[PDB]
Design a protein around this ligand. Structure first.
Ligand SMILES: OCCCNCc1ccc(-c2ccccc2)c(Cl)c1
Length: 326
């Protein structure tokens, strides 16, 4: 079968901690008062959640209320435990309260409010410096959650809130996050299609924190090249073909050979043969002010088939691309 793998960093953080820490199924949840909060407006709608702007009527402070469709109790417990574990970490959304609606029997998570600036409006006003600054802020959040034995598994622009006026960034939506246990085989049906790492697409279940580093690389490539998304798959099989059109099919076979992965027969007639492209090929007149040899070098070290060969969040923070930031 497939060759086993483990993370290169923070490998045994959960193994050396008591059960209390990672055993979310045994975690005791305590509700606050739903009447402390008045809902203002709908902010968004997710697969299993509805997000609202609200007012905490006891202190007149704005909050964010994430109402969960209680589809799977185990998943709600997991997110609550993870949020509690990460509470106060750099650039991590702060869980402030957990409440329930007794009439509809519905749980809700209460967060610190984040004054998010528009993604489609930011995309053109941002400078080379701004990209470096916010990428470093996301890395602070990932290095922290990885050090806490947690993989986010859903890194994408929609899960990154930015209050540009105050240069404040928060990594949100911890509903797909999971505790990392070396040797564990995880469900590959995580992340959003465009941000899925090759390990997910070839159904390699023994993945780790490095998955988040692929997803971050997809975000960086889309920002510096002004191409959203960078890898535009139309389905999960086509997604690997879009990556192969950039990274080449040679390094893809080296990857699957290294881990003795069995490629699904659905890849037989669509994968084709593709040469390894130079990152310089994606530079155009519309994006050249955001591209530099340091950015390309950094990107090349993130977007690698081999999850083990990708930079960790800490190594990424030490890259020359971030020499200009504090
Ligand atoms: O409304 C949903 C939240 C959408 N957030 C907008 C947003 C704006 C900029 C970035 C970004 C990405 C790479 C480098 C620098 C900045 C991200 Cl990840 C997200």
């Amino acid at each position: 079968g497939p060759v086993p793998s483990r993370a290169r960093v923070y490998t045994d953080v959960n193994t050396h901690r008591p059960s209390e820490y990672w055993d979310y199924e045994s975690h005791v949840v305590e509700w606050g008062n739903q009447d402390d909060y008045q809902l203002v407006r709908k902010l968004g709608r997710g697969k299993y959640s509805e997000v609202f702007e609200a007012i905490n009527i006891t202190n007149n402070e704005k909050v964010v209320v994430k109402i969960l469709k209680p589809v799977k109790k185990k998943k709600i417990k997991r997110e609550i435990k993870i949020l509690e574990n990460l509470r106060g970490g750099p650039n991590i959304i702060t869980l402030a309260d957990i409440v329930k609606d007794p009439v509809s029997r519905t749980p809700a998570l209460v967060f610190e409010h984040v004054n998010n600036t528009d993604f489609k409006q930011l995309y053109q006003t941002l400078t080379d410096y701004d990209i470096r600054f916010y990428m470093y802020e996301i890395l602070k959040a990932l290095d922290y959650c990885h050090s806490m034995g947690i993989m986010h598994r859903d890194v994408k622009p929609h899960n990154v809130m930015i209050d540009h006026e105050h240069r404040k960034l928060r990594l949100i939506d911890w509903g797909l996050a999971e505790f990392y246990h070396p040797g564990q085989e995880y469900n590959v049906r995580v992340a959003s299609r465009y941000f899925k790492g090759p390990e997910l697409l070839v159904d390699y279940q023994m993945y780790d924190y490095s998955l988040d580093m692929w997803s971050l690389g997809c975000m960086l490539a889309s920002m510096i090249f002004r191409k959203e998304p960078f890898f535009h798959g139309h389905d999960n099989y086509d997604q690997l073909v879009r990556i192969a059109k950039v990274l080449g099919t040679e390094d893809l076979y080296d990857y699957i050979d290294k881990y003795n992965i069995e490629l699904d027969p659905r890849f037989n007639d669509i994968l084709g043969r593709h040469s390894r492209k130079r990152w310089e090929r994606f530079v155009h007149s519309e994006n050249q002010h955001l591209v530099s040899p340091e950015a390309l070098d950094f990107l090349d070290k993130l977007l690698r088939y081999d999850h083990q060969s990708r930079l960790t969040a800490r190594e990424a923070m030490e890259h020359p691309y971030f020499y200009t930031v504090v």
